[PDB]
Amino acid sequence: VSPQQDFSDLMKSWKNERCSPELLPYPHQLMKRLLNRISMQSQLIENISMGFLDMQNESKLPLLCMETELERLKFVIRSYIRCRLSKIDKFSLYLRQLNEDENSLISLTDLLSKDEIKYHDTHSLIWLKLVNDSILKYMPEELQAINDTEGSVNMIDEPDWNKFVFIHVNGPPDGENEFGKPCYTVTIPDLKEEVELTIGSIYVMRYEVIRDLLRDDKVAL
Amino acid sequence: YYDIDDVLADGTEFPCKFQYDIPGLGYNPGRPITKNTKLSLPLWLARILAIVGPVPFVELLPPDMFSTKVMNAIKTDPVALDLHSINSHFFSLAIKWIMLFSEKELANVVSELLLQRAQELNHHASSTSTFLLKLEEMEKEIYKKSHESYKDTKRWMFK
Amino acid sequence: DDDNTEIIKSFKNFILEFRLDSQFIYRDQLRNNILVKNYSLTVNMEHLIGYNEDIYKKLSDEPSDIIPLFETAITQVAKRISILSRNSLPTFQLILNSNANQIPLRDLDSEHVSKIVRLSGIIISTSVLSSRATYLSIMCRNCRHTTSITINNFTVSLPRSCNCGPDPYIIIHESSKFIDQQFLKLQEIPELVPVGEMPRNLTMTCDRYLTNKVIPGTRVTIVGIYSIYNSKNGVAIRTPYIKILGIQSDVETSSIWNSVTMFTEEEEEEFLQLSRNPKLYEILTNSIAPSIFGNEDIKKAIVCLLMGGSKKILPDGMRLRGDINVLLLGDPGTAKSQLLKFVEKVSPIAVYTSGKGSSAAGLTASVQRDPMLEGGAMVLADGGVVCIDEFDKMRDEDRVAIHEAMEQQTISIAKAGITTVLNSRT
Amino acid sequence: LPAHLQQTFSPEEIQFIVENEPIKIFPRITWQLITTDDKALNNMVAMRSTEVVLWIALLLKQQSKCSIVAPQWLTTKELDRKIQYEKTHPDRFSELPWNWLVLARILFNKAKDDFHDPIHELRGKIQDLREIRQIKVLKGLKYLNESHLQLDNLSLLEINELRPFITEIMDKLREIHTASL
């Protein structure tokens, strides 16, 4: 609940995002309390900056500090969402097929932002509308639908769960998953026998075997 | 798929002969094409003709590029071998043909060749000469990406 | 030799500690050189003299006794960088190119002998490569002493002691490590200072990684030591040569010459930008003869010539050709003989021969024997443009050769024990 | 659309990250400010060490209102035990601050006059420890297999430079092999 922690989780989310091959859940509970918090301090600093001129017929430092800080954290999330919108641009179709299907969790108000959902549907719409008056006129009857034929394929791709991601293993020990010799976690790849995993050492593997560790935040990326 | 390398990879000609006769030749005044005619086909159409049939429509005669002479010559000196001359696509291509024909034997071979190029390509990842000219297009693209990470990390290293 | 330890310690301390703010230029020059497998180093003297004045004081004093202690000094460094333990790693060549003061060719007379001399001249012809030795084993004809001789640079007789004698030592060529050598021969530049006399040409030996670095005919600026060799031809009369370390061509000159089938991206960019011009043809036809006035049909014809044409390998072995031919024939003032010089300049590979062939060069493919393919217009010019003049004035025997060549692109030589059919795509 | 890089981090971004690590300082000064994530501080006492985040130390160092402390692991006498321990275990990469490259760039630009014996020494040391370690990575990189690698203790910058390469040719390599069974 502390500010510092929300920030550490912001950074964590940002890294996990730029690393992974695919989209991650939209963390509204935090990102919204920060989107309120910055609206607060951006008003506050302009207020203290304006009140400062009244004592003027001293030290610009905490103001400069504050402002630089705000530039840094207003950069962070802007990288975040400017990235996620790109992965939405790449996965728009996949997500659509994920939405038409019942199981398991569709976009809702969670998997995407209430702001992002607009971006998704509108981009999707104007894209289909572009290709529609451009190359489909002139429309193949089988190719009317944008979806699997199958082959090849299309898109479908790319929920690619096998791609490699550098991962650094961190999390609180009970002394849950620690089987020795050093520590957690399993592993159990499908194709191969366990390594398994050691915590003070970064080990690159597929994204799929570790997705559950990612959920728990037991390994940073 | 949308990337240019794949859709270009499907563009390559293969020596595949027909199992059956097919009147309505789309290639010229046959009209049918006599059985066991050897006609070069791009990969895109030839890919599912080997599946759909319980005898497939085409024999899938092994491409000259995969000739056992070659798969042998790449086991000597890959690093000095010129890939860009033969196809030029190899990994983008070979990856499809290994699944299509389900050949295990050469996996262990190409899986080796691509380590041996790369233990060389981390060597030109440091800041060409002639060698850059003989890479396969997609491999080449990875060289851009690496060389750029390095260059940029060096330009950050100082001022 | 504690002194050599003292010198080499200073060279190591010059490579490891050198700082241009803040990267270490040399130390990284080294790594980035061993990875590509260049096995060389280029020192910039200004940095050197900046670092210590002393080591440059000795290096301009007795270069040929020192420079190899610098080689061993740097290769002892690449041992600690390129690999680690607790092979084989040749001792790198160093190439040092620096400003100093240009010393023209005419002004080299004694007095600076064995003192590094920067200079400038146009290379005439490059001599065919031949190997010197670096490390060669030697066994005795009798006692069979196994001696590994490390020969250095920069002639050296073999040791006679383990009857036995006088010189019972054989070179084992199965274990001997060899390097390469070139022999440039350079004629000083025509601008200065010929006066009324033919310009002198000093003979130069490039070696290792500078070899084949320079196409003959390109202006360069050599650095190297200045020194003398014997070569019986009295008394005593020893003749002058310039060892090269190391060579640097004039701006650029890479890319061209040295233009490979590959090029930078932005060239494709600007080319593909030129392909978009409606006036493209028409602007090209204005490029060729800035000086030459009119003659537009010729002017366009050159263009369509340079670009080659349809080339067909279709079965059977018959292959049709490109691209065409052009006759400029007419009375003088046509500028055609100048125009050809121009095409010669533009065309990627071109040989202007007005003959009869000239002067020493035969006009066509010719078999000549090595006293211990002779060359000609066609062969040397292969795969591109050939420029001929006085085409009616050419000799008979090779005229046959031409008129058979131009159609089928291949010259066929049955002389003596070689029946070869060799290619002219010109 | 991030354009560059995009899959790997930018060299700058890893400094953007590391500057979030706190380190001790020696303030010359004797508002508030709460800021957001700092938690610090009661008015800093001159000639008294304290723990604060990096980007602010750097910020207050440009104004030379504070003197940053040198990290205990940044020393030449300290580095010596580290290259000694590194030459002698050609396999493992030893123990790294994980930021050490980027702190080695950053703290040398400004803070340089604060270090004891900073000159022509430590840069010579870390440019070295950033040599044998790099070649040891290129010679440890021959053993590449899917899917596993021990990169053990390795800098963030070192990760970032070679990332596209490894995680690309792993994606050509593992791609045939998963798919050939």
Place this chain on the structure above:
Amino acid sequence: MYGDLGNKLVLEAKRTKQLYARSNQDVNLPMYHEDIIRNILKEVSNLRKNTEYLKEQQQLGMLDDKVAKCQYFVTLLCMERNKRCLLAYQRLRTDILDSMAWNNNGLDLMSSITFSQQDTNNLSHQEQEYLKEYCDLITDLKSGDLVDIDLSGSLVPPSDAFIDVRVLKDAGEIQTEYGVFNLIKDSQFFVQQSDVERLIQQGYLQLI
């Protein structure tokens, strides 16, 4: 020969990636090819015409022959091939495009989309409608936040945090926002990262 025009088209598509790669990125796409794709569309119309013709012919003449299947199979693939080309090209074109709409709009005070994208009219109007609709699409994202954003800018993090900008033949003074920087050729402003981000994208500032 059958589907090869698409291979040549994507072969041409590749070149623009080459021009976006190293690169340097100035945009300046040569043109959208309407002609060659018109050839493709006439070829594919040919195809589907013979397809429905033969689809009528199986109903009468072919009488469900084993061979017939092939035409509806193979030639069908060709349709897909053109599609595989036509979209691959097209998405590539949108990738080179939307990013441009990203990094610069453009930027303060956008305040309108004008003079940008040297392609202008040379590029197809069908794409330009998509484009204007797309920057209209991103104006709403601009309107949700309340960051403030400035999302379009600051891809590269601030340091620290004041810089020095050297005028580059710009007039000026057009700096109305925040303050009248009073732009003046041959004048460097010791100004904070704030207005620098916004003004550097336009082309006024030069050295950071």
